[PDB]
Amino acid sequence: KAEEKEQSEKLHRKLQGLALVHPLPDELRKLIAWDMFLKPNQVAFVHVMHYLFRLLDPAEFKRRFFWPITDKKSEANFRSSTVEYLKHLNEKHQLHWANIKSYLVVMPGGMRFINFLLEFVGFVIQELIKQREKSLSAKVMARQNA
């Protein structure tokens, strides 16, 4: 339980950091918490994945996903598509994510899910770093700017 808490906090930090570069949509902003996946949280899952997928490839997201989710059917489709897309990414980038199984999408929560999401978020962050590196202390910058 201690390890689960630590990882969840790490996840929260990474998401907060991402939000500083890419603002969170209003729906997701209210859901974001350090303990949001200690228990299964389907609602947070959908919005977090939505956010991360858009950051990664908005065009691909538009092609693969229907949004916003309006009914149970559309929700089921979102989960299935999520698994498919994640597999695709795993193969394409050789991320070696183990057991991208239906359970990640059915009861998103717990240690296994948090670890997965941490890896995924890490991946998204790495892709963004690459983009930024191509395009191109915080205290010193702040003082200099002032």
């Binding site: 930090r13 907060q16 950091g17 500083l20 202390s137 915080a138 205290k139 910058m141 702040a142 700017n145 002032a146």
Partner: peptide, 13 residues
Amino acid sequence: SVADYAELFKTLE
């Protein structure tokens, strides 16, 4: 820290 950068981004604005 992430908090430091948050403050920096405020300063930059």
